[model samples]
Target: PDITHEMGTTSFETTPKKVVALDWVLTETVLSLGIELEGAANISGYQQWVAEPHLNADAIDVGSRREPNLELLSNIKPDVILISKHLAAAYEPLSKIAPVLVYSVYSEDKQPLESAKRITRSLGKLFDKEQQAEQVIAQTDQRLAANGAKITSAGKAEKPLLFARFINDKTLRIHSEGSLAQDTINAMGLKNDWQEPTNLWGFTTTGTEKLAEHQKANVMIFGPLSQEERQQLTQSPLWQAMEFSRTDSVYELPAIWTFGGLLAAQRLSDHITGRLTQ
Candidate 1:
C-alpha cells in the first residue's frame, strides 16, 4: 500500500504501522499526518536547542544527532525508517533491515511548503492515502497564503526574518540566503537580513558578540542550549545590546527537525504563522 523500495537487497512494504523516524522533522510530519510509529528518536533538547518545545513526550531516545543505537532500533523492528538528509549518513546502515527514507531540509531544501508537498505525496502513495495527502497540501498552502496576506494587509513593514544559532564569541550561526529558514521567510513575503558566508549547508556558527549584524529581524533560534548556555547569552553585555532584543522580536520555537522532511515543514510553517502573528 506504500511506495515499496528495495533498500540494499530487501524490499519493504509501505504504510508501515511500526515506523521509526530518525529525526524530529519526520517524526513531527508523521504525527501531523495522523500516523504514529512504534519506536523512533527523541528530541528532548527542544526546550533548550530551539527555544521551542518538543510535544512528543513518549518518543524513545535512540541517541544524539551523531549517534544512534542500532541494537535498540533492531529490537523495535520498525518496518519503515524516516531520516533527514542531515543525519542520513549516520543511519544508512539500517537500510539493510528496513526501508530508510532520507528527509533533507537543510542547505538547498528549506521551503516547508515544498517539502511538505513532497513528503505528503510520498507518504500518501506509500500508505495509499493520496486523498489525505492532497488535503494536507491544500490546507497548508491556503494557510500560508492566508497568513502572509494578513501580514500584508496589516502593513507589518515587511521586515526580514533571521534564523540565528549562537555558536561562540565573534559569530552567530546563520542559515544561507536559500536555506530552509529563508524559504519560510520568503513564503511570508519577508526577508533574511543576516548576511554571513556559510558552508554548503548554509550555516556558519558564530558568537553572540556579532548579534548586531542580525539585529532587528524576526530571530529564529535553533539547537538546544543548556540553561547555563541560555543564561550565558541572555545575561551577557553583548547579548543585551542585540538589535532585536530591544524590539522584543525574538521567537522561541521548538527544534522540531526542520533540517528538511515532511513533518518538519508542516510544523515549522505552523510555527512561523504563530510567530508572525505574535
Candidate 2:
C-alpha cells in the first residue's frame, strides 16, 4: 500500500499488523482505528495525560518520545513506525529498522484540529480501518454539532471562552490559536479569548496575573495539579482577585490531552458545552 504523510510518501508492502507509535497523537489515532500497537513510547505518560484508547496489553515500551530506545524498536521489528516531528532526528535509524511514518498533528502551517482528523483517516487507511476512521470523524462532527447547538441555543456563543491549565499558584498554560482547545471552541461556534502561544503544541506558559485581563470571559481550567499547588491556587489572592472568579464564570474540567487526536477533541467539545450550557 502506498501511503502519503504530510512529510512524505512511503509504501508499505502489506497492511501494517505490528504498528509502533512514538507520539501521543499517533498512538491515540492508531488505537482509535482499532489497531493494537506493537510498541508505544512513554507508556505511563500517555496513561496519565491522554488517558484514552488504551494501549495494547502487550505493547512494548519503546522509551520516551524524544529518545526512544533504538534497540527495543529494532528488536520489535514493527511493520511500521509512527512518530511526530519531535522524533524526526531518529528517522534515519528508525527507517532502517522499519518504514517510518512522520505524522505530525500540529505544525506552524497546519491547523491542529484539521490535521488531526486527516491523520486519523490516514492511519485508518494504512491499517485497513477506513470505515472505522470515517466513523471517528463523523462521530466527532456529530458530537461537535450537537454541542454547538447547545452553546448557540443558550446564547452563550457571544461569551468568550478561555481554556487554561494550572502549573503552580502563579503560572499557567493557556490554549490559543492552533491548539486543540482553540479549534474545538471554534467548532462549537464559540470564541477563544486568549491568542498567545504560537508554537507547535498550541499553548503559552504565562503568569496567572495575565489571565485577569479577560474581564468578562468564562475561563475553563483543567487538572493534574499537585495537591499543594491546587491548595495554593484556591487560596492565592491574585487568583481570587480575578473578575471571573467573583462572577461564577470559571468552570473546572478533568485533564484532557491538549495534543490528542479525535477522541480528545470529542471530550473537549462535550466538556466545554456541558459546562457553559448545563
Candidate 3:
C-alpha cells in the first residue's frame, strides 16, 4: 500500500510485519492498530504509563526516545521506522534500515485531541487498518459521550477539573488547554481550571500554592504516588486547606501518558468519569 507521511510518500510492498516505534505515542498507536512491534524505545516507560494493549513480549528495546540506539535499531531490520517531528534529525540514518514515517501529534497549530485522531488515522492507513482506525475513533467518541452524559446526569458537569502530576517532592506539573489530558477534559464537556500560560508541551510546573486559586476545582492526579510523598503532602497545612481536598474531591488516577494518542484519551475519560460517577 502507498502511504504519504510527513517524510514523503512511501510504499509498503505488503503490510509491515516488523516495526520499530521511536515514540511512545506511535507505540500506542501501533498497539491500537492491533499490530505488534519488533521493537520500541523505552519499553519500561511505556508499560508504566500506557500500560494497556501491552507490548509484545519479544519486542526489543531500542533505547530512550531522545536517543534510540541506531545500532540496535539496524539489527532489528524493521519493515518500517516510526519517528516523530522531534526526532527528525535521525530520519536520514533510520531510513537506511527501513522506510521511515515521521509525523507529529502535538503541533502548536493543531488542537491536541484532533491531532491525536489524525495520528490514529494516518497510522491506520500506513498499516492497512483503516477499518480498525475508524473503530477506534468511534469507540472513543462513544466513551466520551457516555462520560459526558454521566457528568451531566450527576449534576457535576459544571464542576471544573484540574489535571496534574507530581513533578517532584514539592511541586506539580499542571496540564493546560493545549495538552492531550486537557483536550480530553474539554471533549468530555467538563471545565478545566488551569487556564494560565503553558509551554508547547502544555503544562506548567508550580508549587501547591498555585493550586489554592483553583481550590474549588476537582483535582485528578495522574500518579503512582509513593506512600511517603502522599503522607508528606497530605500532612501539609496548605494541602489540607484546599477546598477540593477538604471536600474529598481529589482523585488519584493510574499513570496515563498525558501526551499520548487516542487510546490515552479513552483511558483518561474512563478514569475521570468513573471517579465522578462514583
Candidate 4:
C-alpha cells in the first residue's frame, strides 16, 4: 500500500480494517470513502454537526473529541484511531489503544479545500480506497464547475459573497478566508467579500450589525435557525437595514459544517448554486 501522508504524525502498517474516528470531520471523511467506522467519538455531536455521509448506526460513541472515552475506544480494538490536532494531547493515551493518526483540516498556512483533498486521499490510501477518493474529488470538482457556470450565466458571479451562520439572535459566525466555505467559493470561481481576519478555522464571530458592511454583496446564511431566532433577527432594525436582507438577497440555506471535509463543500456548492442562480 502507498503510504498516505499529510506530513501528519501517523503512518499505516497494514490497511486499517476497523477504524475509529475521534474528530467529526475525520468521521465524515472515512465514511465518504465507503469505509464503515467501528466507532466515532461524540456521535451526539457528530449527528448534530457533521451530519452527512452517515455514520454507521453500529458505530459506538467513544465520548467527546477533547477527552475521548479511552476504555470504550480500547474495547473497539480498531486497527487505527483517527483524530485531529485538537486532540494531540490524547495521542499518548490513544496510541496505547490503537495506532493513532492525527489530521488537521484547518491551518493558517494551508487552504482548507486543499487540506480536505489531501486528507481524503490519505485516508483513502490507508483504507485501501484510493480510487474511491479520486472519484470523490473529481465529482466534487465537476459540481463546483457546473455551479460556477450557473453563477456566471446569471451574471451574479461578480457580486462579492458573505457566508455566515447565526450563532444566536445576537451573534453571527461569518465565514472568512481560509475556511472551507471561502475555498468552495473560490473553487466556483466566485469571490468572498469578508475582509476581516479569521481564526485558525477561518471564521470570526460577531454581532448581526456586521452585515451592513457589504451592502451590495449577497448574504448566504447557513442554518439550523430556530423559528424564534429567525424572528428575532428579522425584526431587528439592524437586520432590516442590511441591504441584502431587504432586497431578498439574503438566503438561508441548509446547515453545513464549515470546518468539515469535501462532502460538506459539495453540499455548500449545491445549495449556493441552486439559490444564487435562482
User: In order, how many clashes per candidate?
Assistant: 15, 0, 0, 0
Encode model 2's per-residue lDDT on 1-278: one tens digit a residue. Answer: 88997568998778989989889889988888888988998999988888777887998889998888988887778889988877788888898899888888988754887888888888987988999999999998899888998889989899898888887776888888888888887888888889665577788888888886886789888755567867786788886888888999978777688888888999988878878877
Evaluation by lDDT, superior candidate among 1 and 3:
3
Better of 1 and 4 by lDDT: 4
Worst 10 residues of 3 by lDDT: 107-116
Question: TM-score of the candidate numbered 4?
Answer: 0.94
Q: State TM-scores per candidate.
A: 0.76, 0.95, 0.96, 0.94
* Best model per TM-score: 3
Task: State the TM-score for model 1.
Answer: 0.76
Off by over 4 Å in 1: 1-14, 43-59, 85-92, 107-113, 168-171, 216-226, 249-278
Candidate 1 weakest ten by summed lDDT: 1-10
Output the lDDT of residue 115, model 1.
60
- Model 1, range 35-110, lDDT digits (tens) per residue? 7657556565433333222345555676665677888877777777777666757655887666786655443543
lDDT by residue (1-278, candidate 3, tens digit) is 78888878998888888989998888988999998999999998888877876888998999999998988877778898998888999999888888899878877754777776787898888788989999998998888888988888899888888888887667989998688888787778889899888877778889878988998799998866778867877787888888888799999888788888888889889988889988
Winner by TM-score between candidate 4 and candidate 2: 2
Better of 2 and 4 by lDDT: 2
CA RMSD of all predictions? 3.9, 1.5, 1.4, 1.8
Q: After superposition, how far is residue 172 of candidate 2 from its true place, in Å?
A: 1.5
Which rank order by TM-score, best down to worst? 3, 2, 4, 1
In model 4, the runs with Cα more than 4 Å from the true position are 1-13
How far residue 99's Cα lies from its native spot in candidate 4, in Å, is 0.5
lDDT on C-alpha atoms for all candidate structures = 0.63, 0.84, 0.85, 0.83
